[PDB]
């Protein structure tokens with residue numbers, strides 16, 4: 341018979357996943373099939389769509405933790421069995437990220453915090469203050485997936501904005517802070533990056549920004565370890581640096597993302613599934629994933645290895661970590677991602693930042709109301 345694994349991580353890491361699975365299979369006898377879903381237009385939530393109709397995989401690898409709230413609530417995830425996760429081997433925020441309604445539903449594999457990747461050919465020294473940033477941006481260019489909340493939240497949070505109010509670990513989905521005076525100021529700066537700085541056009545997105553950077557046309561770009569391989573293949577002499585402080589003198593607040601692995605509740609071979617998951621998420625595995633893409637391991641013991649401690653990716657990570665905000669993992673967070681398109685209207689000047697902020701929050705509250713039966 342066969343065990344099917346769906347991976348949302350591609351590139352070098354995918355190859356490591358396949359070799360580890362092959363080795364596990366030689367001992368267990370089950371045939372293991374790995375499918376690359378990273379390019380699926382349906383996105384991360386495609387797992388629920390498939391799992392709802394009994395067409396899902398047995399194991400899922402490389403899923404950003406925010407998505408699991410939906411899967412867990414709909415009963416598409418098998419709870420993590422006892423003895424598999426030792427909460428003491430990870431930072432506390434990493435563990436909270438995999439818990440849904442108090443139950444651990446997935447295993448952490450890596451931790452992510454977006455940073456600024458720069459071309460040392462154009463930008464010898466990375467900017468640290470907004471003043472230096474404007475200087476380097478006007479001179480050699482800057483672009484990123486500007487209307488994607490995952491990335492621009494760094495600015496929003498920097499101005500005091502927030503998605504759901506955090507009350508000592510408990511999120512209040514009724515207290516949204518995306519239309520506070522601070523957020524509006526953030527949206528204005530986002531608008532300015534196009535209308536006055538002219539660093540980007542209302543049309544610029546992640547695809548264009550990445551292509552431009554790989555062609556050596558722009559000096560800075562906001563990204564993550566998922567682009568490490570493509571950058572090295574383009575032989576760009578790059579560096580990694582945290583977001584600069586914003587014009588209000590505050591530090592930007594990027595999201596902290598935890599990449600996870602989990603088991604489908606419908607899978608008939610759950611004992612074997614978890615054994616496989618343990619192999620794909622072990623300390624040895626995490627060392628392999630770090631090798632090429634520089635993916636930061638979730639396990640604290642591997643983070644302490646000298647190879648990791650000395651990498652540019654880890655240095656930026658450690659300097660931004662205390663300012664990073666873990667993405668909410670509750671079901672309502674999906675309503676946020678889906679109402680996100682409004683940001684493009686604000687950036688394009690179709691609506692003012694004031695009104696756009698209001699429309700954004702209203703579309704989120706509506707989407708949330710839609711959820712729940």
Ligand SMILES: OC[C@H]1O[C@H](O[C@H]2[C@H](O)[C@@H](O)[C@@H](O)O[C@@H]2CO)[C@H](O)[C@@H](O)[C@@H]1O
Nearest residue numbers: 384404406407452488489490566597677
């Ligand atoms: O853009 C919405 C999207 O944001 C996050 O996805 C990240 C992902 O976590 C990163 O690993 C990388 O792939 O960049 C993505 C953003 O382009 C959320 O995790 C995801 O659920 C959401 O759809």
